[PDB]
Amino acid sequence: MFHYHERELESEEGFMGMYDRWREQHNIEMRSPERFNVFKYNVRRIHESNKMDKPYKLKVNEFADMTNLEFVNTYANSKISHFQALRGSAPGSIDTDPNKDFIYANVTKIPDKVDWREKNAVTDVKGQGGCGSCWAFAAVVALEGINAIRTGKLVKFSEQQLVDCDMTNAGCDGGLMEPAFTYVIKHGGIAPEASYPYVGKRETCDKAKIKDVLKIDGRQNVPGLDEEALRKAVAHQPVATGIQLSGHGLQFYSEGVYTGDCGTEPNHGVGIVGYGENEKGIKFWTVKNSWGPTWGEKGYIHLQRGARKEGLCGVAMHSSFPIMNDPNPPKPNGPKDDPDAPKDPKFKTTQRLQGIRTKLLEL
Amino acid sequence: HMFHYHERELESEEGFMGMYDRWREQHNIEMRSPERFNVFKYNVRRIHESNKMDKPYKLKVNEFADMTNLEFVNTYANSKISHFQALRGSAPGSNKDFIYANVTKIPDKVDWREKNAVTDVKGQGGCGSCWAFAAVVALEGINAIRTGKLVKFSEQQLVDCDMTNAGCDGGLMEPAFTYVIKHGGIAPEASYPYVGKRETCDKAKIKDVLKIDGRQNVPGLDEEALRKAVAHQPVATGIQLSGHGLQFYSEGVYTGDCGTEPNHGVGIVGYGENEKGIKFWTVKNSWGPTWGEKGYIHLQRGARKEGLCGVAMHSSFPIMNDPNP
Incomplete structure (x- = not known):
């Protein structure tokens, strides 16, 4: 300092x-x-x-x-809110096929404090530079997290492969994290950073650097404007989300819980790696930034949790994660597995129930 | 209408x-x-x-x-006030020379629109001239107060002629009043009409000028000092109008989230308190009468040290010496 x-x-x-x-x-x-x-x-x-x-x-x-206008235009210009308006749903919106729903919707036993950095699922703090690639950075925090959780091996993935190869997004001009995971599913996987190093400017999609890929099973969005739904997802794996990191206080943030003013128009993608509550009673999100370890709390920001419906700085607006199907699903214990429990609770898609009846009457 | x-x-x-x-x-x-x-x-x-x-x-x-909010803000709210203030200006919190420092009897509610000191709501267009617009709200106000004649002034003169500021790329309201002092005055809008793009400084359109005696900044991060100035004359200030809620504001007191990088200029024309107890600022915008409450926004008052949206960060006014103090 x-x-x-x-x-x-x-x-x-x-x-x-x-x-x-x-x-x-x-x-x-x-x-x-x-x-x-x-x-x-x-x-x-x-x-x-x-x-x-x-x-x-x-x-x-x-x-x-640097003036904050200069700062933001160099380091916080991924235009997430903008691209979400052009090619996306309003925060909060429900699924197309309401089953697939939200994988963590029904979890019950979750920690009060989570920190993925302690469970060896978080790589070192990275730097994005002048490139509006934070959508790739955030998507990669989520990708590194689930791989580390499922394989037990902590591996750094390529934001550069996403910048160069993901044509659904706008490279260094910005983009969205959900289409980035769709890219990782549709294009056979994301290579490690050692294989596809970061440059900080868009280049040609080099398929010869794409090897030792992490393949994902799916992707899902966390139900928007729900910090509890977000807490439920973070408790299982790091989550990618946008935020508005505009303003002097965020440009110079060093330590503590940021409770200050911010707009709700996300412009920068980040990875939520944890949550908790400090000694003074302030609930927070532990956010991993891409502005090097020289910024904030060794590259991190403890952002206030439970502050607004949309979350402080629009953290709970547009959040998503890559899915790697659980090989050993838990486990609670009670209530009984209901045979009459419908596969579709709206009874629109299917009339089928989860089980079959054993006790049978003639009618 | 609706x-x-x-x-x-x-x-x-x-x-x-x-x-x-x-x-x-x-x-x-x-x-x-x-x-x-x-x-x-x-x-x-x-x-x-x-x-x-x-x-x-x-x-x-x-x-x-x-329009996406990024598109809207970059078309209508890009005057870079916070930016230009950092490059060529003092940090907010810049009370002894301030002309209204020692006033005692001030109204609890003020609305200059009712005291015939506020012109119609204007439109700035794609130009980042909101520093000229804020400066003109303040200029029209003091003239109407001192002369009793409500006259529309030229934002266009300031855009074309004020070389200390960056025309349609933005600027500061205080150097705009310094321009009005140093260059012998601001012409009415009828004389120098608004185009919405920077043009050549035409001195043949500069006539029937309003000359001002001086200029002063309201002490920053003090909404009471701001209340004291507004009580006497409309005040020019930068404000942060980014975000969906401000893009679509229609009525009531805006109490929502806001950044504190006061990059877009406005004129504070009054203040008061809602029947629900919410203290507010009546702000005149340059986005036409089609936006907000007939072109206005009742912004929350007394909410932050810097004011909601950084309203109490960088505020100033033109001085026309009181003939009867």
């Missing part, structure tokens, strides 16, 4: 010294009155925020000399 | 397609596409879902129903 004293803010000389010290500490070759002005703007705002009674803290990070 | 629909139309694709075509016929949209129809269902479902909730505000299916 970068530290400073309150007085460096009182004078232009003290502030200029602090600018150049920050520049040296983060290896910024730029040294301009404009950039110095932006630094002053951002630092005063961090300073003012940290003075408040907030559950979260901000730090003078490597992005300190 | 676009009506029934709940059952949302249940079927045939019904939704019907509603979409009726929406095109009502708003004169001559573009029909599966993509645009998809955007329409996206916004309509979100509008329907919101209005189902117990909210202090309501949303309507306006003319922007076919």
